[PDB]
Amino acid sequence: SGAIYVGNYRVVNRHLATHNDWANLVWEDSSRDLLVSSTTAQGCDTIARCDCQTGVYYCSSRRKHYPVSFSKPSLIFVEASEYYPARYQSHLMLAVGHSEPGDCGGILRCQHGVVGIVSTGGNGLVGFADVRDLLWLDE
Ligand SMILES: COCc1ccccc1NC(=O)N1CCC[C@H](C(N)=O)C1
Ligand SMILES: [Zn+2]
């Protein structure tokens, strides 16, 4: 679990979105595993606008933050799950690191701000859904 709160928006993993999120839907994309809903309270996260490939992520299954090197956002094959069939997920960045189910939603940050959220894992790898291209999150 976890979310990004920026302006009047809440960014969450689409497969973990609630009834309130879908009732206040702004935008969703199954191919990215992202959903943005509207909030009544003002969010104060800064979204990074950069091509950083190093940062720090929060891993809930370890109650710890880890530094990582991560790949550029790309189309990566993701195995079938209870939420989606086997498919290419777009805008996904991989890193070598721990991640298990329950870790989705943990934030990945660089010195510029929030880069993305944990979305995939397994095999000693962790995948993050990028949010840096969503320029409208501020305006
Ligand atoms: C982050 O931990 C997830 C995980 C860790 C370790 C092993 C498997 C997973 N399961 C995982 O990748 N999926 C979870 C459900 C939806 C995800 C998606 N974006 O399509 C795919
Ligand atoms: Zn950066």
UniProtKB/Swiss-Prot annotation:
Record: residues binding Zn(2+) 1: C50, C52, C110, H112
Active site (catalytic residues): H15, D33, C104
Catalytic activity: Selective cleavage of Tyr-|-Gly bond in the picornavirus polyprotein
Role, per record: Cysteine protease that cleaves viral polyprotein and specific host proteins. It is responsible for the autocatalytic cleavage between the P1 and P2 regions, which is the first cleavage occurring in the polyprotein. Also cleaves the host translation initiation factor EIF4G1, in order to shut down the capped cellular mRNA translation. Inhibits the host nucleus-cytoplasm protein and RNA trafficking by cleaving host members of the nuclear pores. Counteracts stress granule formation probably by antagonizing its assembly or promoting its dissassembly.
Subunit structure: Homodimer.
Name of the protein described by the UniProt record: Protease 2A
Organism: Coxsackievirus A16 (strain G-10)
High-level lineage: Viruses, Riboviria, Orthornavirae, Pisuviricota, Pisoniviricetes
